[PDB]
Design a protein around this ligand. Sequence first.
Ligand SMILES: CCCCCCCCCCCCCCCC(=O)O
Length: 265
Amino acid sequence: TADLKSLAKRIYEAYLKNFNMNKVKARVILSGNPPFVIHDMETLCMAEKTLVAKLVANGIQNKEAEVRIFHCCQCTSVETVTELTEFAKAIPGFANLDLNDQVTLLKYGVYEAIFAMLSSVMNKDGMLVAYGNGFITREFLKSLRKPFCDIMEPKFDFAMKFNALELDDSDISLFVAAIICCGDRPGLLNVGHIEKMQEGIVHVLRLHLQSNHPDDIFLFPKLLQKMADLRQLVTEHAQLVQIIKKTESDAALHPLLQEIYRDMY
Ligand SMILES: CCCCCCCCCCCCCCCC(=O)O
């Protein structure tokens, strides 16, 4: 229907406006200011001097490479949280929710959305970083000292299967909106209204996938399962972050992310 197709287009346009990275932009870069390839410590350190110069301007006081990398991971998440917060305003009913419910939905949804969207910048060999200006290899990330080598690999595993679904930005935008609209998040004040907001977005997602992916009759339930898989990926990620927090004193957690993780798992 015109209203439902228009809603899907709205959410797609809001996604293109609000996220610095989209799947088309990522694919243009990945196909070959080209991205600097980070595949070892030499190339990490060269990339840092150009792309995150302040982080390595401290001489012998610079942090360990793994800690610098984790800091850059967190800065990326902080920026994506800001983008997701603006995007959520395009979702029918979201801005009409109580301010506290908006906070709760974003708190529990952002990392699920982050890992879903991260797939768009990942291939089997590595991922784009730093606003598309670096490509860091999967093998380099696996080579880091424990526990830091354990951060990205499960996200690559998720992404390879997610990317095999061959979603486009029009699908991913609605999937991210659906992640944000979960009525079963803890602490919600108006569950009923959130459930109806969820039902509306999920209806739009179902119809859109039927229209955009006529070849895959299971795509909607596949994506419902991916949402559950993302919840488990995030719980596991939070457990690893808590290990880092307890055992890696140099790996300072950004305060916005500390609040997101607080009282989550
Ligand atoms: C010189 C640039 C080095 C870049 C280092 C890798 C950046 C990865 C960005 C994606 C991070 C995904 C994981 C987020 C982790 C978290 O916020 O808890």
